[PDB]
Ligand binder design. Structure first.
Ligand SMILES: CC(=O)c1cc(C(=O)Nc2cc(CO)cc(-c3cnn(C4CC4)c3)c2F)c2cc(OC(=O)N(C)C)ccn12
Length: 111
């Protein structure tokens, strides 16, 4: 029987992973707000990255009821990660920090 789910009904499912991401020591910091190309002086960002995503956007979507299915949220988390792996060199802090978050995402899912 078809139904719109309340944010709380999905919070139980999604919040454990989201909290694990936010908690990471310095590693979540480049992901806590949208990438701001003006501020950061990287005017090509949106040439490379067409669908930006960050943790504040994921949290807002959760809390407003925009995730109705977990696959939507998992898609979003991986979009954020793939955007970073795509734009940033393998050598960069942002890239390696992204990798740490991905590792944390997977471990939290599968202990
Ligand atoms: C996610 C992503 O792609 C991205 C994030 C940033 C970026 O600098 N985000 C950011 C935001 C905030 C808080 O507002 C903190 C940090 C940050 C990184 N390390 N730290 C610890 C010193 C305290 C904080 C951060 F990297 C960035 C910069 C970029 O520009 C750049 O690296 N240069 C050299 C121009 C390019 C991409 N990003």
């Amino acid at each position: 029987r078809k139904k719109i789910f309340k944010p709380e009904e999905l919070r139980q499912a999604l919040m454990p992973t989201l909290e694990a991401l936010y908690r990471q020591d310095p590693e979540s910091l480049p992901f806590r707000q949208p990438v701001d190309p003006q501020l950061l002086g990287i005017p090509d960002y949106f040439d490379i990255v067409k669908n930006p995503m960050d943790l504040s956007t994921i949290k807002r979507k959760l809390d407003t009821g925009q995730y109705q299915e977990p696959w939507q949220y998992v898609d979003d988390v991986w979009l954020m990660f793939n955007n970073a792996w795509l734009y940033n060199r393998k050598t960069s802090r942002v890239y390696k920090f992204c990798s740490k978050l991905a590792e944390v995402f997977e471990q939290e899912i599968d202990p």
